[PDB]
C-alpha cells in the first residue's frame, strides 16, 4: 500500500463542504454582510 | 487555467493542526488522534472554477528536514498555526518559520502565507497583541483567521481562505503601500464601463445594472438592496450616485472597496467574464476564435451584426447629424488598444460635405474588412463586446460562409451580396475618376485631396431591380504581369483613353493574357469623353474588337460635370456580376 | 448513460481472491496479505464511456450473512472464484453460491456472472472438466477466465471482462438457444447499411468502408487487412463478398461473428454512433433536438440541406427519368418507421404526365414541412442521417431563422425566399382552379382527380426579375369568421365570381373584417372569364371599389384553355409580396 | 475515519490501467488476433 494513493472525500452528504460551496459563489449582495473572526489587509 | 492547489500546514508540536483536518473530514471532534494525517484531497465540484485541492500535514517527529524542504518547495500556500494559550509559538513564528520558508525561496516570487490561531475556546476575551507587528513586518501575510475545532468555529472557512490565496490573487490588483489600485486594473475597468453603458450618457441606470448582474454574477439582486449599495457609495464619496445612478468613479470605488475588504472573487468574476486573464490582458480564444473557410468561398456578415453596428452608430452620434466627427470617432476607439482606421478610410467610403464618415460609409467600411481579412474583423468585434452584449457563444456567429463559385455557375443562381470588380488600365487615364465616381464626387471635389492619403479600394451600395447590394472596385496598377490574386474577381472594367491612341493596346493585351480563357464577363468603358476624341492607332477598331468578342458595346464616362456623376455604369457592372450566363442580348 | 459499476468477488476461504485486488493495486504479488481489501475504485478515464468502477471484496470471517445479502442485492456483476488445485470449491460453486445469488433474486432479471479460476501456476496441463456441465446448466454464466496472480496471467483482463458485462450487454442482441440474432438488431442493422451505401447498388466498396471506419471506430484500418476480412467472410459464407465488396448478408455475418466470438464493443459503438440505445430504438436528443424560434420569424433550409436532398434524389432515381415511381418512393421510405407522405402530396406538388413526383416537387414538399412544423422536418432528416453523412453537430444546423417582419417593413428590405398567400373566396367559384394553375394543370387535368384525395395547400417556384422563389397558396374555406392563423400572411388573393352577383359582397366583407386595417398588400382577381359576364348586384362597382382602396386593378383568369395556364398573376403576387411599400404606380 | 471515504488509484503512471485502456479501444482489426485463457459463449 504506498503513499501514491489519493484519498478522496466525496462532496455529497457533507455540511462543511456545502458551507464551502455556498461561500464560494460570487454575489454582489455581500456589501452589507459581516463575518466574525477574520481580519484582512485594509479592513474597515 | 490551473492544475492543482496544495495547502501545507506547519507549526509547533501540540497545537492541534492535525485535529483541524480530522474535524474537517469527520464533521465532529475526535478526542484521540494519530500524529499525522494523509493527503486528503477535495474534489473539483466544491468551487465553480473546478480546480482540485490537496491538503497535506507535517509533523516534526515523523518527518525529516530534507522532506520538509521538499514539501515547502512543492507548495502553493502555507498556513502557520499558533496557539493563543502559549507564548513560545508566537516567538517561533518570527524566529524560525517565516525565515525557514524564505530561506531557500528567491526574492522574485514568494508563496502567500496564512496565519492560524487555535485554542480560542480556552481564553475568554478575544484579543490580538503580538501578531500586529508581524503583519507590519512581512508583506506576505494577508489573512489572520482565528479558529477553534471544539466549537467548530470557522473550520470550513480556513481552507477556503487558503485556496483563495492561489485561485483569486490580490497581487496584480492591489498595491498595499500607496493604497490604490494598479493602473492595469484601472485601464481594465474603464473599458468594461463603456461596453455596459448602452446610451453614452456617462451613467449606469437600473436597467443596465441588472444586465450586468445577470451576465457576471448570475441570479440578480433584489430591488431593495441596490439602493443600499447606492447609499453607501453616496456616503463614502461625493461624486458617486448621479441622477440616473452610478458613474465611473462610483464603479471604481465599489470595486476598490470590494478589493480592500477582502471579497476578491466578485471583481475576478467580472474581469474573467469579459475576457481578461491573471495578467490583465485580453486572451486568445476570445480575440482569435477558429473559423473554417473552404476554398473559393467568401465571408459575409449576417443580419445580427447589422443591428449591433447600427446600434453602435446610434449610440455614439450625440449631436444626431447622421455623421461622425473626429471627436466622436475618437470616442468610438477608446475601447481599442490602437486606432484601427487611418486617414485612408475617409477617401475609401462615402462622406458628407466637410469630410466626415457617414452612415453608409460606416457600414461599408465594416463590409470591407470582413471580405479581405476576416480575422481582423473578429478581432475588432471582440473589443466592442459582441459576445457579451448579444448572448452568443463567440464572435464567429456573426460571419456566414456563402456558396462556391463553380456551383453558382453550374446552377445559374447566386445568393451573394458583395461583388468584387477589378479596374485594369493605363496610368494617367482617369482610373481614380472611375473609383471616385462610385462615391459621388466630381472633379472639383477630386482636386482637393492629398496624394499622401490616397486609396486603391472603393466600396458603395448599388440598387438594381429594387435590391440593394455592395460594389467594390480595386485599382490594379500597371505592372506588365499579374499574380493570382489579381485574376480572382467577378467582373472587370477595362478602361481606355480616348486621348491616347496607345491605351487600347495594353488593356486588350491584358485581355489576351489571363482573362479571355476563363468564363468571366467583362466590360469596356471610355474615359474623358469631355475632351476631343482622336482616332486610335490600333489595327482593329475598338468598337469592332469589342463587338467581336461577344461583349456589351462600350459606354461613355466623364467626370467633368458640375453635379454628381451618373450611376449607370456601376448598375450594369452589378447586373453582369449577378447573371454571367445572361448576355445583354438575352435580357 | 450509467451511474456506476460495482464488481463483487465471492468464493471459498483460501483461494487468493484478495491477492488479485492487491496485485492489481500493487502491480506485483504481496506474499503476506490482509484478509480483506477496501473499496478500491477506478476512475472514469480508463474507459471511453467514462463510467467509474467500484471493486469490493468479501470474506466470511469478517462479514455476516445480512451484510452478504445486502451487498449481493447492491451489485451489478458477481465473480465466483475457484481454485484448480482443489475439488471442494467446484462442488461449492454449484452447491451454494449460484443458489445463494439466485435465492432472493426474482426471475424477471438476473445479474450476470463471471467464473474465475485461480492457482493455475501449480498445475501443468491446462484443462477444463467439471465447469462444462455448469455452463450447460445455468444460462447466466458467460465468461470463464482462468488466471494466476504469481505470473500476472490475465489480471488486467478479469475486471475488464466483468465491467463489459454491465456496460456492453449481450442480452438484447444474442439469443443463445436458436443461435441467431434478435430481430430488433436485424432491423437495427439494415437501416445502417442503407445510409452508409451512397449509390444504391447494393454493395459497399472500399470508399464507403473507410468512411464507416472513420465515423464509427476512428483511426481507420490498414489497406491490407481489409482483404483478410473479405477473405474470411468469403470463406465462411457463399453470398458474401461481391465484385464491389460486402453485401448486406456479409455485413450481418461479420456482426454476428463479432457477437459470438466475444468482441461486443465493436457493434455497440456502431449502434450507439448512429443514434440507438440499450433497448435498440432511436433516442431523444437525436430525433428531437432543441431549436429556438423568435415570434414573427420563419424557418428556412440553408444551402447545405439543398445538396443533401439533391444527392438523395440522385441516389434513389435508378432509371434516370427525373421522376420518382412508387417503387422508388417505397425504396426511399424503407429507412422510416412509417410512411410519411400519403396520397395528398401528389396533388400538392408538381408532377409529370403519369402522376409521379418530379424533381421540383421533391424539393417543394421539403420546403413545405419546414415552413409549417419544423420539428417534423428535424425528425425526418434524422432518419436519413443528416448528422452522420455530413459531419455536423446535430440536425439543427440545417435550419436558419430569418428576420422579423416588422424590421423588414421598417427598413424596406427583405431577404426571404418563401412567401405565404391566403386565398379567401366563396365556395364553388373556382378557388381550386387558382391553386391548381400554379402547378400547371388545366381543367381537363383537373377533372381526373378524386375528391377523397384533395388538397388545400399548394407550393411552386416563381421566377421574378431573374430570381427564383417559392410561392405557397392556402385555401381558407367559407367559415363566416376567421381565427388568428388565417390573418397571418404576406398577401392575399381575394377572388370573386363573374357569374354570381353575390360573391363580391362576401370577399369585400372579409376585406372589412380584419384585413384593411393592417398594412398588408392585397390583390383582387376575376375567375371563370370564359363564361358570359353578368353585372354584379353590389352597390359600388367592383372596379370602382377596387380603385378606391389604392389597389392594383383587377386581373382576369380562366382555366378553360387547352394548353397550360399563364403564370402572370402569381408573378405579380410574388412582386407585391417582396415590395409592400412599392405601389404599382411607383414601379 | 469512516467507510464513507473513496480511495482512488490515479490513472497516470500505471501499466495495468494502460493495458485496460488499450484493450478498451474499439477497432475492427481484431478479426485475426487471438487471446489466451478465456472461453466465451459460442467460442470457435
Ligand atoms: N479545546 C480545544 N482542544 C483542542 C483543539 N484542537 C486540538 N485540541 C486538543 O489538543 C490536543 C493536541 O493536539 P494534537 O492534534 O494531538 O497535536 P498535533 O497537531 O498532532 O501536533 P504534533 O504532535 O506535532 O503532530 C488534542 O489531543 C486535542 O484534544 C481545539 O480547537 N480546542
Ligand atoms: N477634361 C477632363 N479631364 C479629366 C477628367 N477626368 C480626369 N481628368 C484629368 O485627367 C487626369 C487623370 O486623372 P487620374 O485619376 O489622376 O488618372 P489615373 O489613371 O487614375 O492615375 P492616378 O494619378 O494614379 O490617379 C487628372 O489629373 C484630371 O485632371 C474629365 O472628365 N475631363
Ligand atoms: N502460486 C500462487 N499462489 C497464490 C496465488 N494467489 C494467492 N496465492 C497464495 O495463496 C495464499 C492464500 O490466499 P489469500 O489471499 O490469503 O486468501 P483470501 O483470498 O484472503 O481468503 P479469505 O481468508 O477467505 O479472505 C496467499 O497467501 C498467497 O500467497 C496465485 O495466483 N498463485
Ligand atoms: N367554363 C368554365 N368552367 C370552369 C372553369 N374553371 C372551373 N370551372 C367549373 O367551375 C367549377 C368550380 O370549380 P372548383 O375548383 O370546384 O370551385 P371551388 O370554389 O374551388 O370549390 P371546391 O369544390 O371546394 O374546389 C368546377 O366544377 C368547374 O367545372 C373555367 O375556367 N371555365
Ligand atoms: Ca446609461
Ligand atoms: Ca456627429
Ligand atoms: Ca456502393
Ligand atoms: Ca424513376
Ligand atoms: Mg499534529
Ligand atoms: Mg480473502
Swiss-Prot record, chains B, C:
Record note on what altering residue 208 to K does: Abolishes the formation of thread-like mitochondria
List of residues binding GTP 1: 14, 16-19, 59, 118-119, 121, 149-150
Spans within the Cytoplasmic topological domain: 1-587
Positions carrying N6-acetyllysine: 92
UniProt keyword Mitochondrion present: yes
SUPFAM superfamilies registered for this protein in UniProt: EF-hand (SSF47473), P-loop containing nucleoside triphosphate hydrolases (SSF52540)
Alphabetical GO biological process terms: cellular homeostasis; mitochondrial outer membrane permeabilization; mitochondrion organization; mitochondrion transport along microtubule; regulation of mitochondrion organization
Binding site for Mg(2+) 2: 428
Keywords carried by this UniProt record: Acetylation, Calcium, GTP-binding, Hydrolase, Isopeptide bond, Membrane, Metal-binding, Mitochondrion, Mitochondrion outer membrane, Nucleotide-binding, Repeat, Transmembrane, Transmembrane helix, Ubl conjugation
EC number: 3.6.5.-
Keyword Metal-binding included in the entry's annotation: yes
InterPro entries: EF-hand-dom_pair (IPR011992), EF_Hand_1_Ca_BS (IPR018247), EF_hand_assoc_1 (IPR013566), EF_hand_assoc_2 (IPR013567), EF_hand_dom (IPR002048), Miro (IPR021181), Miro-EF-hand_domain (IPR052266), MIRO_dom (IPR020860)
Linked residues for Glycyl lysine isopeptide (Lys-Gly) (interchain with G-Cter in ubiquitin): 153, 235, 572
Family designation: Belongs to the mitochondrial Rho GTPase family.
Name under which the protein is recorded: Mitochondrial Rho GTPase 1
Organism of origin: Homo sapiens (Human)
Taxonomic lineage from the root: Eukaryota, Metazoa, Chordata, Craniata, Vertebrata
Gene (name only): RHOT1
Amino acid at each position: 500500500l504506498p503513499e501514491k494513493l489519493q484519498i478522496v472525500k466525496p462532496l455529497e452528504g457533507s455540511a462543511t463542504l456545502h458551507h464551502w460551496q455556498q461561500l464560494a459563489q460570487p454575489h454582489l449582495g455581500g456589501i452589507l454582510d459581516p463575518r466574525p473572526g477574520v481580519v484582512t489587509k485594509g479592513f474597515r | 487555467m490551473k492544475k492543482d492547489v496544495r495547502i501545507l500546514l506547519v507549526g509547533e508540536p501540540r497545537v492541534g493542526k492535525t485535529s483541524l483536518i480530522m474535524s474537517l473530514v469527520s464533521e465532529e471532534f475526535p478526542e484521540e488522534v494519530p500524529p499525522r494525517a494523509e493527503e486528503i484531497t477535495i474534489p473539483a465540484d466544491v468551487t465553480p472554477e473546478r480546480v482540485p485541492t490537496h491538503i497535506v500535514d507535517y509533523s516534526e517527529a515523523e518527518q525529516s528536514d530534507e522532506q520538509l524542504h521538499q514539501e515547502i518547495s512543492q507548495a502553493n500556500v502555507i498556513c502557520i498555526v499558533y496557539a493563543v494559550n502559549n507564548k513560545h509559538s508566537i516567538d517561533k513564528v518570527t524566529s524560525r518559520w517565516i525565515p525557514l520558508i524564505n530561506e531557500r525561496t528567491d526574492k522574485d516570487s514568494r508563496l502567500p502565507l496564512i496565519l492560524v490561531g487555535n485554542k480560542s475556546d480556552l481564553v475568554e476575551y478575544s484579543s490580538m497583541e503580538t501578531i500586529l507587528p508581524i503583519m507590519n513586518q512581512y508583506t506576505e501575510i494577508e489573512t489572520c483567521v482565528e479558529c477553534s475545532a471544539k466549537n467548530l468555529k470557522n473550520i470550513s472557512e480556513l481552507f477556503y481562505y487558503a485556496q483563495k490565496a492561489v485561485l483569486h490573487p490580490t497581487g496584480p490588483l492591489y498595491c498595499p503601500e500607496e493604497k490604490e489600485m494598479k493602473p492595469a486594473c484601472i485601464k481594465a475597468l474603464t473599458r468594461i464601463f463603456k461596453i455596459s453603458d448602452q446610451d453614452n450618457d456617462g451613467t449606469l441606470n437600473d436597467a443596465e445594472l441588472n444586465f450586468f448582474q445577470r451576465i457576471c454574477f448570475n441570479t440578480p439582486l433584489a430591488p431593495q438592496a441596490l439602493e443600499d449599495v447606492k447609499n453607501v457609495v453616496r456616503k463614502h464619496i461625493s461624486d458617486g450616485v448621479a441622477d440616473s445612478g452610478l458613474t465611473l468613479k462610483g464603479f471604481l470605488f465599489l470595486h476598490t472597496l470590494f478589493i480592500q475588504r477582502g471579497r476578491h472573487e466578485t471583481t475576478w468574476t467580472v474581469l474573467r467574464r469579459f475576457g481578461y486573464d491573471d495578467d490583465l490582458d485580453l486572451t486568445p480564444e476570445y480575440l482569435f476564435p477558429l473559423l473554417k473557410i473552404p476554398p473559393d468561398c467568401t465571408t459575409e456578415l449576417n443580419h445580427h451584426a447589422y443591428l449591433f453596428l447600427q446600434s453602435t452608430f446610434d449610440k455614439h452620434d450625440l449631436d444626431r447629424d447622421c455623421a461622425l466627427s473626429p471627436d466622436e470617432l475618437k470616442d468610438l476607439f477608446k475601447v481599442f488598444p490602437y486606432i484601427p482606421w487611418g486617414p485612408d478610410v475617409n477617401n475609401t467610403v462615402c462622406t458628407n460635405e466637410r469630410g466626415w464618415i457617414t452612415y453608409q460609409g460606416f457600414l461599408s467600411q465594416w463590409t470591407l474588412t470582413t471580405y479581405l481579412d476576416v480575422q481582423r474583423c473578429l478581432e475588432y468585434l471582440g473589443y466592442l463586446g459582441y459576445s457579451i452584449l448579444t448572448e452568443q457563444e463567440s464572435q464567429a456567429s456573426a460571419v456566414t460562409v456563402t456558396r462556391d463559385k463553380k456551383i453558382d455557375l453550374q446552377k445559374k443562381q447566386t445568393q451573394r451580396n458583395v461583388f468584387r470588380c477589378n479596374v485594369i488600365g493605363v496610368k494617367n487615364c482617369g482610373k481614380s475618376g472611375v473609383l471616385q465616381a462610385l462615391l459621388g464626387r466630381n472633379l472639383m471635389r477630386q482636386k482637393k485631396i492629398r496624394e499622401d492619403h490616397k486609396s486603391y479600394y472603393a466600396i458603395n451600395t448599388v440598387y438594381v431591380y429594387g435590391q440593394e447590394k455592395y460594389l467594390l472596385l480595386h485599382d490594379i496598377s500597371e505592372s506588365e504581369f499579374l499574380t493570382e490574386a489579381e485574376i480572382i474577381c467577378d467582373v472587370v472594367c477595362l478602361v481606355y483613353d480616348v486621348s491616347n491612341p496607345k491605351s487600347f493596346e495594353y488593356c486588350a493585351r491584358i485581355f489576351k493574357q489571363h482573362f479571355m480563357d476563363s468564363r468571366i464577363p467583362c466590360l469596356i468603358v471610355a474615359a474623358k469623353s469631355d475632351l476631343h476624341e482622336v482616332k486610335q492607332e490600333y489595327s482593329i477598331s475598338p468598337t469592332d474588337f469589342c463587338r467581336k468578342h461577344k461583349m456589351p458595346p462600350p459606354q461613355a464616362f466623364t467626370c467633368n460635370t458640375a453635379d454628381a456623376p451618373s450611376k449607370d455604369i456601376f448598375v450594369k457592372l452589378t447586373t453582369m456580376a449577378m447573371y454571367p450566363h445572361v448576355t445583354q442580348a438575352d435580357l
